[PDB]
Design an enzyme around this catalytic site. Sequence first.
Site, short mmCIF file in Angstrom:
data_model
loop_
_atom_site.label_atom_id
_atom_site.label_comp_id
_atom_site.label_asym_id
_atom_site.label_seq_id
_atom_site.Cartn_x
_atom_site.Cartn_y
_atom_site.Cartn_z
N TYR A 11 50.44 48.02 50.84
CA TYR A 11 50.45 47.91 52.30
C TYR A 11 51.84 47.78 52.92
O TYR A 11 51.93 47.72 54.14
CB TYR A 11 49.55 46.74 52.69
CG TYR A 11 48.10 46.98 52.28
CD1 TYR A 11 47.28 47.80 53.05
CD2 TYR A 11 47.59 46.40 51.13
CE1 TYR A 11 45.96 48.01 52.68
CE2 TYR A 11 46.29 46.63 50.75
CZ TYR A 11 45.47 47.41 51.54
OH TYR A 11 44.20 47.66 51.13
N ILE A 16 44.56 52.62 48.81
CA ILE A 16 46.00 52.52 48.63
C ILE A 16 46.46 53.42 47.49
O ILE A 16 45.73 53.74 46.57
CB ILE A 16 46.49 51.07 48.39
CG1 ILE A 16 45.74 50.44 47.25
CG2 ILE A 16 46.40 50.26 49.68
CD1 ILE A 16 46.40 49.16 46.73
N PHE A 41 41.66 36.48 47.48
CA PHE A 41 40.93 37.08 46.37
C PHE A 41 39.75 37.86 46.95
O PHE A 41 39.12 37.39 47.89
CB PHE A 41 40.49 35.96 45.41
CG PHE A 41 39.63 36.36 44.22
CD1 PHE A 41 38.24 36.48 44.33
CD2 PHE A 41 40.21 36.64 42.97
CE1 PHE A 41 37.45 36.85 43.23
CE2 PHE A 41 39.42 37.00 41.88
CZ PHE A 41 38.05 37.11 42.02
N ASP A 42 39.45 39.04 46.40
CA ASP A 42 38.36 39.90 46.87
C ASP A 42 37.73 40.59 45.66
O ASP A 42 38.46 40.96 44.76
CB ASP A 42 38.88 41.00 47.79
CG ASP A 42 37.88 42.10 48.11
OD1 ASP A 42 36.70 41.76 48.38
OD2 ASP A 42 38.27 43.29 48.08
N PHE A 83 45.17 43.93 40.63
CA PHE A 83 43.77 44.25 40.54
C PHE A 83 43.31 44.33 39.10
O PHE A 83 44.07 44.75 38.24
CB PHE A 83 43.44 45.63 41.13
CG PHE A 83 43.55 45.70 42.63
CD1 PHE A 83 44.78 45.98 43.23
CD2 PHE A 83 42.41 45.54 43.44
CE1 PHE A 83 44.89 46.09 44.60
CE2 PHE A 83 42.52 45.65 44.83
CZ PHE A 83 43.76 45.93 45.40
N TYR A 85 35.71 45.97 40.95
CA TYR A 85 37.08 45.48 40.96
C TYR A 85 37.14 44.03 41.45
O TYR A 85 36.23 43.51 42.08
CB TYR A 85 38.01 46.32 41.85
CG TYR A 85 37.75 46.07 43.32
CD1 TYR A 85 36.71 46.73 43.98
CD2 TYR A 85 38.53 45.16 44.05
CE1 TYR A 85 36.43 46.46 45.31
CE2 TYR A 85 38.25 44.88 45.37
CZ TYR A 85 37.20 45.55 46.00
OH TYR A 85 36.87 45.32 47.31
C1 LIG Z 1 43.30 45.86 54.08
O1 LIG Z 1 41.97 45.37 54.19
C2 LIG Z 1 41.33 45.05 53.03
C3 LIG Z 1 41.85 45.10 51.73
C4 LIG Z 1 41.07 44.71 50.62
C5 LIG Z 1 41.56 44.69 49.26
C6 LIG Z 1 42.25 46.02 48.88
O2 LIG Z 1 43.46 46.10 49.04
N1 LIG Z 1 41.49 47.06 48.45
C7 LIG Z 1 39.98 47.09 48.38
C8 LIG Z 1 39.55 47.90 47.21
C9 LIG Z 1 40.24 49.28 47.15
C10 LIG Z 1 41.73 49.09 47.00
C11 LIG Z 1 42.21 48.39 48.23
C12 LIG Z 1 42.11 49.23 49.40
O3 LIG Z 1 42.61 50.36 49.45
O4 LIG Z 1 41.51 48.67 50.42
C13 LIG Z 1 41.50 49.34 51.74
C14 LIG Z 1 40.10 49.99 51.84
C15 LIG Z 1 39.84 51.29 51.73
N2 LIG Z 1 38.50 51.43 51.88
N3 LIG Z 1 37.94 50.22 52.09
C16 LIG Z 1 36.49 49.98 52.30
C17 LIG Z 1 38.93 49.35 52.04
C18 LIG Z 1 38.71 47.83 52.21
C19 LIG Z 1 42.60 43.48 49.07
C20 LIG Z 1 42.94 43.28 47.63
C21 LIG Z 1 43.93 42.15 47.49
C22 LIG Z 1 43.32 40.78 48.00
C23 LIG Z 1 42.86 40.90 49.43
C24 LIG Z 1 41.99 42.23 49.64
C25 LIG Z 1 39.75 44.30 50.91
C26 LIG Z 1 39.22 44.24 52.21
O5 LIG Z 1 37.93 43.86 52.54
C27 LIG Z 1 37.05 43.96 51.42
C28 LIG Z 1 40.04 44.62 53.26
O6 LIG Z 1 39.56 44.55 54.55
C29 LIG Z 1 39.07 45.76 55.12
#
Ligand code: A1H7U
Length: 122
Positions: free
Chosen positions: A95, A69, A49-50, A112, A39
């Site tokens: 969030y 999420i 961006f991630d 995404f 992703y």
């Molecule tokens: C809320 O914290 C985080 C959220 C993400 C990213 C995110 O929102 N993600 C990561 C991929 C899966 C969907 C979603 C998410 O549920 O992230 C919370 C999550 C659940 N398990 N893990 C390992 C994470 C980071 C977000 C995407 C929009 C641009 C900034 C990053 C990556 C993060 O680090 C890779 C992160 O830090 C832990």
Amino acid sequence: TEQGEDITSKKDRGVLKIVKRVGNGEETPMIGDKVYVHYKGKLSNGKKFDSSHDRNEPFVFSLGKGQVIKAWDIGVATMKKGEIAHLLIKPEYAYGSAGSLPKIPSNATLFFEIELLDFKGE
Ligand SMILES: COc1cc([C@@H](C(=O)N2CCCC[C@H]2C(=O)OCc2cnn(C)c2C)C2CCCCC2)cc(OC)c1OC
């Protein structure tokens, strides 16, 4: 423009999906299956961006378990193996008002790109 199929049960346009690449095979994952994805994620305004590509390993989770999420649980459930999809996500499916600073501000809309690599039963 905010394009895509509304894949929310409530039909509140909270999660909008576009298929960018059609997958192989007709099957989508069930709740509980172990899913493997690549992703790319960013804020709608593009200021953070991630990607899984940064670490060159898939992102692995159990579908429908709230490990990610809400938009991901809803969205990946609609995807076929090999499919690439784009998701536009209102904060209520991500969030919310609290956000998750510094990556995610309060009430952020997220985008995404998700590639469904594979999935297997629990
Ligand atoms: C809320 O914290 C985080 C959220 C993400 C990213 C995110 O929102 N993600 C990561 C991929 C899966 C969907 C979603 C998410 O549920 O992230 C919370 C999550 C659940 N398990 N893990 C390992 C994470 C980071 C977000 C995407 C929009 C641009 C900034 C990053 C990556 C993060 O680090 C890779 C992160 O830090 C832990």
